[PDB]
């Protein structure tokens with residue numbers, strides 16, 4: 001099985017113990033590390049942070065301590081939008097320009113592949129033709145990587161993609177049968193399935209539906225999303241289940257109503273290191289659990305939640321990671337991807353569970369080491 005671990009090039013700016021750079025990664029935990037994110041300019045891949053080139057080298061230097069480790073560079077993401085992707089795939093000329101720049105970029109800076117993180121073809125302003133043109137891009141990229149590999153005597157560059165976990169986005173964005181033929185792996189973003197945008201509490205990445213859920217609400221679980229991809233043309237062995245090392249936060253309208261579906265108000269509280277409303281890293285969650293919070297096991301969905309006064313948290317822990325790891329193995333899936341390794345308790349000083357408790361749980365459960 002594969003354990004694919006995303007690293008983010010803005011984590012370096014978190015204060016104090018939150019600051020995370022490539023040298024903080026244990027090179028033996030994962031089979032693949034993915035660098036989030038590269039940008040694009042004039043249909044060519046490019047850096048985004050002032051020190052990306054330095055971080056690239058430290059990132060790929062991790063392979064000096066693990067002969068099996070592979071690295072990839074992710075391009076795009078949520079804030080990147082869709083407009084540059086729409087322009088780049090619109091013509092064969094622009095796709096060739098981009099693909100050519102990618103091969104040169106990855107080989108110069110030491111990456112073993114590219115992870116396409118377009119959010120999303122056919123949505124967020126992307127026109128309908130991008131559903132098919134995305135397949136063309138991946139096909140042309142896979143073929144160009146294959147050519148470069150056989151001519152250079154080097155292992156072929158990987159082409160992967162982070163893909164939507166929302167059914168509406170999936171249907172508008174991906175030709176699953178043909179796309180799955182050319183991607184090496186399909187990293188399914190089976191998280192952000194509930195959050196403060198809904199106005200009530202819900203789990204970030206529940207494995208199963210809540211018992212009373214019907215209709216489109218019954219889409220919002222890992223089991224449904226993964227089986228959607230599998231049953232609509234994707235081979236199970238290429239499908240990678242998304243594992244969040246963070247949770248989503250809410251403000252309860254009434255602290256006395258603190259179950260699943262309890263009413264909530266604004267965007268949710270922010271954490272002292274990630275400093276973004278609605279979002280807590282796992283190491284920030286451990287601090288919350290030690291501040292007097294009540295812990296509850298969501299038995300139907302196989303995930304935890306916790307609350308204290310007016311704050312409510314839906315999240316993942318060792319127990320839920322273990323349940324999902326066993327589940328994905330018994331469903332013949334390709335492994336797990338983690339968003340993101342800089343959100344684990346990488347110092348070990350927050351959770352009293354050792355270093356990288358969530359990532360290590362998957363390392364052991366997936367037979368990585």
Ligand SMILES: CC(=O)N[C@@H]1[C@@H](O)[C@H](O[C@@H]2O[C@H](CO)[C@@H](O)[C@H](O)[C@H]2NC(C)=O)[C@@H](CO)O[C@@H]1O
Pocket residue numbers: 010076077078079117119162274275276279339
């Ligand atoms: C694949 C993807 O788009 N994942 C999202 C992350 O990008 C989000 O992180 C946020 O990313 C922006 C752009 O780099 C940063 O400016 C922002 O600080 C960062 N916030 C945090 C807490 O890391 C993430 C949270 O919004 O949601 C997805 O994971």
Ligand SMILES: CC(=O)N[C@@H]1[C@@H](O)[C@H](O[C@@H]2O[C@H](CO)[C@@H](O)[C@H](O)[C@H]2NC(C)=O)[C@@H](CO)O[C@H]1O
Pocket residue numbers: 078079119165166167169191192193195197278
């Ligand atoms: C399954 C699904 O499509 N859920 C949607 C969420 O993804 C989305 O949340 C946003 O997700 C982005 C990654 O895809 C994050 O970068 C972004 O921070 C996050 N926005 C938040 C937490 O406010 C929400 C809100 O846009 O919609 C869901 O439908």
